[PDB]
Symmetry: D3
């Protein structure tokens, strides 16, 4: 029924749009009016694009925007049935936010995090409602991508998973159940695949462009892995490999040294104008 | 030019079709008439499907079939410009055949292997022609799939590479350059991905179908890794990991114990009615 | 209920004895009279020792020996409800035995292996009743030791597992359910512990006596790890590590070089008069 | 010849160690930084002695004699004339060094300086003193009054004389010492905790249940506890920390802690002490 | 290149300064205070005096060389220099600061090089707006005599920046090699793991310290055995390099041996402490 | 003292020479007359160089050859005091030879192997005189190279070791004591250095020439690792890395895939005219 999204950045704003799009009332919290407005402006822009394409009615864009209430006040979360944290990827911030909501929110509230790399279970333990703590891992762009990885911490109750599953379906998404482990499903498979491509390039086995063509034509992938690395962001790819190696303690997942070098140069991919390809 | 394909199974016959179809004279060789004739039957069937599909006229079918001469006699390769060895077999006898071809063939002839598990360099060393020995890795089905991984043995000359590259383009393919290494590009990246999926299943992190769903929706792939494993054949997948682990000596590429158990059960995927899914 | 034990060595004989002791009619099959009679005579001696010590009455011993019929003829397994193979572990042979038994025996017959190191699943694939093949792993001495690790191949049915579980209880054993994996439970944990001790010794960290004393007093174990290795047999300990490393592909389970050296010396422990200690 | 010992850190382990010495005719000092800690340690010793009285293991008067040999304090200088000092305090290296450096200045030269640490380098601690030849590990097992094993840990500069002296003292207080050249996990932890970590791996992959793993080990290897219940008994946080040290020190992924063990610890499911680990309590 | 600034008046810095002045180049030698600069200049004066005394150069040659070296504390004196060499061993945070400051101060042509092998040149270069002009130039002690320079290219280092540094290296009598930035470059990447391996052999009682060293000297014709070499380099240094190799690669192949850790922890660092694998 | 060398190949002939130059009586055995004469020629030819460069007198050359008798009869080993096997690097054959020698030779005979790669302990176990079996690892060229790695099997006696140490000194060598382990000392350290260089090359970090120059100038080595590889032979280098990986079970010692590719090409180094460098052209 009523949802709070903590953080009005790229994912936060998209998650807010996704719920609001399906008739849910949405509180959207950030820490300065400027940041809130930036999120509302971004949603508004997305929704204009959709009206412009004839995909929705102008009245629908308005109905959706009116369902979203921006705020800088964390107490606005208190009567919400679901909170989705999409803040900065920093463990102490996660834990601080969840501990506080645990006190601010009514007992029934489910507390979810969109985190890619941090332990749901650890986050849960900072609260006295671990049974109600869960991961809800959306994919960019949140309004469009149907996949949600529903991450169960070891103490996440079946009741909590079931409600989030149903809520996920209710907003037009296709949820999958994942017991907490490093990289969940998608990143666990995909990022090492990008890291493997780096390895091939580093040893002069083939060129950036041949590696990518080989994967596109040979495995029927939409993008080649290096192109994909650039799209996701090489700093993100590296941080993910760092967590896989760190969490597993298995050198299997060691990020390649050439990857480290690209990142240290600021050659992060599309968003910096340069990565494995020049933009 | 004129080309010889050695091996009249589905890959060999397919490759011969791809050349004949582009105006090249082709000698298809296998070890007895009944293998040769089966392969020509297979090709005939393939070209028959393409008339019904509307893509070519029956006349063209006939013309394509006239360019292909079946034989048991390896001496018919003597004046060929390119010889493509496609018969899956042991290193000991592949070496013989390349050595045999080295004596038989005119000095211009390039000797190519379709292998993906054996060393191109090692095979080349059984000939006095190592600068003219090269890998040409086609993808199933050979007539339609555009990718060719052109595999350079350490002695393969730039001349030999450039000729095979241009020949590849002449038959409608999109060649990539690959220095010989374990798994080339496609397998080196793709198979460990399937192996990774096995690992996630094995630790009860997610079900078979949620793993595949997550990869299809999350990474926009047309098949999930486990479903893909069943399609390739889990025996084939295991054998590839075996090669990667054996060649690298890096336990990063260790095949998962669970994959070994599926294969020892004869649960090979589609071809046996059962793998990670049952059919 | 009627059981067949294949292999009149120490373990096979002990197994036959445990079954006979609990009311089961038992066929004991080996490849030659000499081995069969040696088996029966080992069981006689065990039972006579128990009489002498006053644990069983003479008439109990006589009844027990009556329930065991020695034979060299595998067709005597034909109507047994359970067959337990306890011959020496060579996959090619074990597969032959299991295939033969598959044709000889009635369809209800469950086929069990006492192997510690060969794949139950792979053995099962040699038969047309993979759902009736299973591991039953006994501990020396079988008449005395309570544990049975019941090893499910990936195709072993619930019904087959439930029947073996009940039978184990019926013979006064305490079965545990183990999905097939390298080392099952006990060896998977115990041998690497012995291997670890060897490493400590090899780096001069502590003496043989102090390593074993530390573990006895510190972990409340009845034998220290090196003693235990000597008791089990160092050749046996090394073969298990070899299997763990070979199946996992994880160098976590590499056997220590010092252990290899002891075994190559013939310094196997108690059975040779010398291992980590002198006997 | 040692007859006066100072124990530093009045927790479970330090108080157990003070009691083991007090019970065997040493003059014992027990130091902590706050009287509250000291008093609590005394209460803990009082309590274990009372349980022995009540079991009929010892007379009440014996208990009163034992308690009299122990003098609590917060003044570090009370260690000055001790023949032996056993530090059993916080496991943080920089503070441990400071303690040992101060003891080095405070103590007569004959005084042997020991640590009960399981995780930190004796060699490294010794290097903060001018008496590295007289620094040593004396690793006790909980409960210290009952368990006979002591792992006597030699730093690379520990002298034969220092070891001999600690060896014969251990034998004098009724303990059974073993000699261990410093390395990660000494003997017991180095072998035992990886057994526990291995059980977690078996569990994680659905190979067998918690109860079946433990039964298999108890019956199959003739152990009194299974690895998973033993982890719960030791404390899964303690188990994870040790694995962490083994992996960190060796740099060998052979000793990587299982990811599932990490998840139990992160949940606060530490075993008996939290009412939940691999089993419910 | 006419004018070079060397930052750091320690042994390494002063040595590099000397090598440049000896070959005709004008040099600015910079450090943090006058005492250090003067110490460095006295060190150089002494080296050159040794060369005069042994008959390698004439007194007037020594004087000429010394006059090409100007000493300072002020980093602004590097502004018109064509090459800057940051010699002092730094923390990453300070290094980045220094390079960022040089980037703002110097004329746009100036190439900014680092002698310091432990840190990523690519990472340092990202602290400036001239990453194309940031490079590694790794000398060997003593820098006036040792011919080898490992010229380390950051991933953004331009062909023009490398070519200039290669040419300058040859102009000062050195023998440069090209190295793409990677952990341990060439020399340390091969050499230090060899020492580490020796330690593993020692730890398992396979052979004694002396027999290990004898074996390598006589069997592989090495000038020093691995264990005495460890002592000469400094075992703390050796450990720190293995730490970097393991940390950067993430491969257990390069794990420092636990016995090496114990020697360092004891303060038994080798010659510099009077004791390592040998007693000095 | 009488010595028997099994194998008149490069190493055996060299070893035989080294013993006869120091006054020992030598029996040199191979399986055909042709191979014996080949060995004796090779020795004669080496000694002729030592004369024609004034290193020894013509009379010394003759004395030396006189102390050597070629044979095809293994029974000529029977009364020798030391047998050195330098035949063929196959475990079955070493076992076979040593089993037979154990029966043929008098009880006092010490049985030594020149093997680089095979277990001394295992070879010794095919005899009933394991206390008398040992490794004597010579370096090419055996007559010149001073180092000998004396390899103790786990059963090799102190007596046997000291005898072989004394004999090693007596023939003007500098022996070192090595407890059996993969690669002994020299190869265990040296070959992975070469393997490491290969990895630097494979990743485009530096060229062949620059790698070797870096090592020569930077480490004061006479040869760089890649040219050293070519000199030793890349097949030999790969076979050693294979043994290290095989015996240790540790990926630390995995041979680089690039090395494997060079060897498969027949680019083995100097012996084939091409390895990391071009020699023949
Ligand atoms: N970006 C992606 O593609 C992606 C994909 C999947 C998951 N995630 C996860 O989502 C999170 C990152 O989201 P993003 O990419 O939108 O980041 P972002 O930097 O775009 O937005 C973060 C926002 O959080 C706000 N914030 C910081 N502290 C806060 C607090 N205490 N309360 C409320 N708001 C606060 C910031 O002001 C900022 O607007 C991470 O946890 C990441 O793991 C991101
Ligand atoms: N060549 C080297 O530089 C080198 C270096 C280190 C160690 N080794 C060791 O030396 C041994 C041999 O090397 P090599 O270079 O002399 O080989 P080689 O092939 O030059 O000579 C081997 C000789 O052994 C003979 N032989 C085979 N079986 C025999 C038998 N039963 N009795 C007597 N002779 C027999 C052969 O006829 C041949 O003449 C190997 O064990 C090898 O590991 C050699």
């Amino acid at each position: 029924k009523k949802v709070c999204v903590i953080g009005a950045g790229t994912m936060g704003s998209g998650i807010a749009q996704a719920f609001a799009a399906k008739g849910f009332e949405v509180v959207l919290r950030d820490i300065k009016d400027e940041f809130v407005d930036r999120g509302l402006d971004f949603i508004n822009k997305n929704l204009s694009k959709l009206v412009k394409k004839g995909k929705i009615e102008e009245a629908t864009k308005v109905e959706i925007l009116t369902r979203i209430s921006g705020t800088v006040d964390l107490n606005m979360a208190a009567d919400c049935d679901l909170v989705i944290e999409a803040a900065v990827e920093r463990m102490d911030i996660k834990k601080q936010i969840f501990a506080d909501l645990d006190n601010i929110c009514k007992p029934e509230t489910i507390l979810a995090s969109n985190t890619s790399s941090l332990s749901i279970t650890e986050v849960a333990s900072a609260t006295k409602r671990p049974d109600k703590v869960i991961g809800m891992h959306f994919f960019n762009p949140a309004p469009v991508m149907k996949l949600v990885e529903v991450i169960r911490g070891i103490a996440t109750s079946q009741e909590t998973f079931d409600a989030v599953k149903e809520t996920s379906i209710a907003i037009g998404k296709d949820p999958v159940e994942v017991a907490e482990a490093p990289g969940f499903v998608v990143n666990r498979i995909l990022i090492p695949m990008i890291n493997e491509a780096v390895g091939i390039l580093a040893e002069g086995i083939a060129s950036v462009e041949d590696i990518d063509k080989a994967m596109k034509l040979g495995a029927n992938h939409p993008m080649g892995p290096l192109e994909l690395g650039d799209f996701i962001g090489l700093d993100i790819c590296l941080a993910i490999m760092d967590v896989l190696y760190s969490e597993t303690g298995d050198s299997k997942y060691r990020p390649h040294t050439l990857l480290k070098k690209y990142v240290r140069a600021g050659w992060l991919g599309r968003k910096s104008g340069k990565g494995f390809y020049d933009y």
